Amino acid sequence: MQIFVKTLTGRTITLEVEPSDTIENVKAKIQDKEGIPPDQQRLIFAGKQLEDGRTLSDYNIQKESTLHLVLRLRGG
Amino acid sequence: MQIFVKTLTGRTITLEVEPSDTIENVKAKIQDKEGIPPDQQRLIFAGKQLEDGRTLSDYNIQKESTLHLVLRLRG
């Protein structure tokens, strides 16, 4: 299914995902598509930060839902 | 000299730079430190989108000043 991933300035991309995909999985897909390392990514749905080990369906993320992506700048 | 690079969540890092560094050079340093491809980096100082061919002193970016890093999400 298709979901949207959005930045705080409104920039948007689309991802192909499965309901059982983990957030870890989703970050790997963003890396594949955009070249952003998974440990630089923080994903947000319904104003809450998503945990790597949980699935899309765990968070009731559905087709055409929108997630927000922000940078961790984890390299410091 | 050091400058700050800040995101729209407030996440802020410090970068060691020179006035003569080009914006391209700075994005390379960000790629070096954070693993973010330069093509994903939009840098903004005093309301302006920074262009790769110009230098920090070119934009009057001085010691201890802050610029913003925002994602492009192109590729």
Numbering used by the authors:
A (entry chain A): 1 to 76
B (entry chain B): 1 to 75
Sentences from the paper on this structure:
During ubiquitination, the 76-amino acid protein ubiquitin (Ub) is attached via its C terminus to, most commonly, Lys residues on substrate proteins. Ub has seven internal Lys residues and an N-terminal amino group, all of which can be ubiquitinated, leading to the formation of polyUb chains. For the remaining four chain types, linked via K6, K27, K29, and K33, very little is known, and proteins generating and recognizing these chains in eukaryotic cells are still elusive. We found that the human HECT E3 ligases UBE3C and AREL1 assemble K48/K29- and K11/K33-linked Ub chains, respectively, and can be used in combination with DUBs to generate K29- and K33-linked chains for biochemical and structural analyses.
We crystallized K33-linked di- and triUbs. The K33-linked diUb crystallized in space group I4, not observed previously for Ub, and a structure to 1.85 Å resolution revealed eight molecules forming four identical Ub dimers with clear electron density for the K33 linkages. In this structure, K33-linked diUb is compact, and distal and proximal Ub moieties interact symmetrically via their Ile36 hydrophobic patches. The symmetric interface did not provide a model for the conformation of a longer K33 chain. The distinct conformations of di- and triUb could be due to differences in crystallization conditions but highlight the underlying problem that crystallization may present an incomplete picture of the dynamic states of free polyUb in solution. Although the diUb crystal structure has captured a compact conformation of K33-linked diUb, solution studies suggest open conformations for both chain types without formation of defined interfaces, as reported for chemically assembled K33-linked chains (Dixon et al., 2013). We assembled K33-linked diUb from 13C, 15N-labeled monoUb and measured 2D band-selective excitation short transient transverse relaxation-optimized spectroscopy (BEST-TROSY) spectra, revealing well dispersed peaks similar to monoUb. The small chemical shift perturbations (CSPs) in all split resonances could be attributed to the proximal Ub, whereas the distal Ub was unperturbed. Mapping of the perturbed residues on Ub revealed a small region surrounding the isopeptide bond at K33.
